[PDB]
C-alpha cells in the first residue's frame, strides 16, 4: 500500500482529468488506485502534483497510464521519452541505507535502472518522520528504481 507523487506538466492536468472528470475516474478504475490531483501551492506553477495511492500493482498501472497519456497528448514527442519527476516519502531512519555507505547504493541504483535518484541531503522529516527520495526517469526506469528502493526499505525493517 504505497503513496507516490508524480509531477506532470501543468498544461496536462486537463488531459489527465478529462471532460467532467471522465478520464481520471477511468484511470483509477483501470488501476484501482486513489488518484488525487493537488491544487498548486503557487499561482503560476510549472508542474502539478499527482498523488497516487495503492499497492505496487496499482502504482504500476496508474503511473503507466500517466506517462502514456502524456505521450498520446503529444506533450512530448515524437521521438522523445516521457521523463517525469516522482517523489516517494521514506522513513528518515532508512534513507541512509538508500544512499548506502559512500553513496555506493544509490550509485548502483542509478547504474542499474538509468533513473536519476537523489536523496536531498539533510532534509527536515515531515510529521511521519519521513524524507523524500526524488526519481527522474522514463517510465520503466522509475518503476524499477521504485521497486528496488522499496526492497532496501523492507530490509531495514530487520
From Swiss-Prot:
Its main location: nucleus. GO terms for biological process: CRD-mediated mRNA stabilization; dendrite arborization; mRNA transport; negative regulation of nuclear-transcribed mRNA catabolic process, deadenylation-dependent decay; negative regulation of translation; nervous system development; neuronal stem cell population maintenance; pallium cell proliferation in forebrain. It is found in: Nucleus; Cytoplasm; Cytoplasm, Perinuclear region; Cytoplasm, P-body. The keyword Repeat applies. Residues 1-66, 83-149 form the KH domain. Mainly expressed in the embryo, including in fetal liver, fetal lung, fetal kidney, fetal thymus (at protein level). Also expressed follicles of ovary, as well as in gonocytes of testis, spermatogonia, semen, oocytes and placenta (at protein level). Expressed in various cancers, including testis and lung cancers (at protein level), as well as kidney, prostate and trachea cancers. Keywords: Cell projection, Cytoplasm, mRNA transport, Nucleus, Phosphoprotein, Repeat, RNA-binding, Synapse, Translation regulation, Transport. Residues 81-91 are annotated as: Sufficient for nuclear export. The keyword Nucleus applies. One of its GO terms (cellular component) is cytoplasmic stress granule. Induction: May be up-regulated in response to CTNNB1/beta-catenin activation. It comes from the Eukaryota. Coiled coil: none annotated. The modification Phosphothreonine is found at residue 124. One of its GO terms (molecular function) is mRNA binding. RNA-binding factor that recruits target transcripts to cytoplasmic protein-RNA complexes (mRNPs). This transcript 'caging' into mRNPs allows mRNA transport and transient storage. It also modulates the rate and location at which target transcripts encounter the translational apparatus and shields them from endonuclease attacks or microRNA-mediated degradation. Preferentially binds to N6-methyladenosine (m6A)-containing mRNAs and increases their stability. Plays a direct role in the transport and translation of transcripts required for axonal regeneration in adult sensory neurons. Can form homodimers and heterodimers with IGF2BP1 and IGF2BP3. Component of the coding region determinant (CRD)-mediated complex, composed of DHX9, HNRNPU, IGF2BP1, SYNCRIP and YBX1. During HCV infection, identified in a HCV IRES-mediated translation complex, at least composed of EIF3C, IGF2BP1, RPS3 and HCV RNA-replicon. Interacts (via the KH domains) with HIV-1 GAG (via the second zinc finger motif of NC). Associates (via the RRM domains and KH domains) with HIV-1 particles. Domains KH3 and KH4 are the major RNA-binding modules, although KH1 and KH2 may also contribute. KH1 and KH2, and possibly KH3 and KH4, promote the formation of higher ordered protein-RNA complexes, which may be essential for IGF2BP1 cytoplasmic retention. KH domains are required for RNA-dependent homo- and heterooligomerization and for localization to stress granules. KH3 and KH4 mediate association with the cytoskeleton. Two nuclear export signals (NES) have been identified in KH2 and KH4 domains, respectively. Only KH2 NES is XPO1-dependent. Belongs to the RRM IMP/VICKZ family. This is Insulin-like growth factor 2 mRNA-binding protein 1. It comes from Homo sapiens.
